[PDB]
Write a protein that binds this ligand. Structure first.
Ligand SMILES: Cc1nc(N)nc2c1C(=O)C[C@@H](c1ccccc1)C2
Length: 207
């Protein structure tokens, strides 16, 4: 298991998300679903010129999986996935995100719901999650598990468990007071409100 420090600005961003008083937390789901949709777009595009890239799975969709026993909400896609390098770069650094613009915008009257405009929607997971675990598989690499409870660090390890073919699974270990997002009616409401036009099937698992 390898432990890494977030780039300073990413740590600052996560701290702002965790510590700012902001009640409209439901937008995290929209942001993760949009990330999944973008990843599905990418594998769809790549497979046009190389259909063998779908050998790891033809189906392009998004699964939402609540588990009240474990207090987790899991968002799974069969999108492009991330290599180890992709994981560390995209989740651990500013990379090509608008991290800087976002934090300046918040100081200038923007609100946290606008996080998606700045390519850092992933971090909105920390509105509702005390820990986030990300399992991912890209065609060009092995399966990896990334994990962080914030506090300035994250871990990465090779994941030799059940192979997932291709895609990304985001596991939200919910804060104690955020269990509403495990409720079928609440999830349906949020999907209908914010993600009704997503171009891929979104299946809400039942328990
Ligand atoms: C391939 C993929 N699939 C999913 N489901 N989600 C993501 C990705 C990425 O590649 C980027 C990653 C990210 C995280 C943090 C900041 C910016 C981008 C989010």
């Amino acid at each position: 298991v390898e432990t890494f420090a977030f780039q300073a600005e990413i740590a600052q961003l996560m701290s702002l998300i965790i510590n700012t008083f902001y009640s409209n937390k439901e937008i995290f789901l929209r942001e993760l679903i949009s990330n999944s949709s973008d990843a599905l777009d990418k594998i769809r595009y790549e497979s046009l010129t190389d259909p063998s890239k779908l050998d790891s799975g033809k189906e392009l969709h998004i699964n939402l999986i609540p588990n009240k026993q474990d207090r987790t909400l899991t968002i799974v896609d069969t999108g492009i996935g991330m290599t180890k390098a992709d994981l560390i770069n995209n989740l651990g650094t500013i990379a090509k995100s608008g991290t800087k613009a976002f934090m300046e915008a918040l100081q200038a009257g923007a609100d946290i719901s606008m996080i998606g405009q700045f390519g850092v929607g992933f971090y909105s997971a920390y509105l509702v999650a005390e820990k986030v675990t990300v399992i991912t598989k890209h065609n060009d690499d092995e399966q990896y598990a990334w994990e962080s409870s914030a506090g300035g660090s994250f871990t990465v390890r090779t994941d030799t468990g059940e192979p997932m073919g291709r895609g990304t699974k985001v596991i939200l270990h919910l804060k104690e007071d955020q269990t509403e997002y495990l409720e079928e009616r609440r999830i349906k409401e949020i999907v209908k409100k914010h993600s009704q036009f997503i171009g891929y099937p979104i299946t809400l698992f039942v328990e």
